[PDB]
Design a protein around this ligand. Sequence first.
Ligand SMILES: Cc1ccc([C@H](CC(=O)O)NC(=O)c2ncnc3[nH]ccc23)cc1
Length: 167
Amino acid sequence: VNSFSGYLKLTDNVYIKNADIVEEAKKVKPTVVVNAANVYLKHGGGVAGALNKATNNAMQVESDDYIATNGPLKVGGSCVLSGHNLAKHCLHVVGPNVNKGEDIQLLKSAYENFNQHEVLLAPLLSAGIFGADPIHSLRVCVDTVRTNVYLAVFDKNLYDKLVSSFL
Ligand SMILES: Cc1ccc([C@H](CC(=O)O)NC(=O)c2ncnc3[nH]ccc23)cc1
């Protein structure tokens, strides 16, 4: 039993809700919140911009130190950093950005990072400003993640379409 509330159950392990991931994180304080990161951990917009704003830019300060030490992530890769006031940990995961021409096949690799964590709050990777089809992203999520994932879809209209079209 966990603290996530109001999710529709899509599969044995995947749940979905129309919710702002920032507000959901502040309420649940999950062990792991997933960020829709880029390789530079520059959290300027999209999900990352919103999460970072909610940390009063502390996420960005920590991220800049991480990059200065380790260099950029790989597309499809991840790193674990602090969750600040939102969660115990933030798993920064880099899905491919279609508006940068990156191979959508790397989306499965990106979701594989979720399997290292027993429970996660997460957005659909490569969705929104990353330009991928969110319906496809949901399919890859369900077919790749085996741990318990609670997906927050900010757009109510997109949420209804994701549910109604789910196979
Ligand atoms: C790569 C990538 C980018 C964004 C997203 C989802 C799309 C969605 O689920 O609608 N965006 C958000 O979560 C979002 N975007 C902007 N400001 C926000 N403030 C609180 C939440 C929030 C998914 C995947």
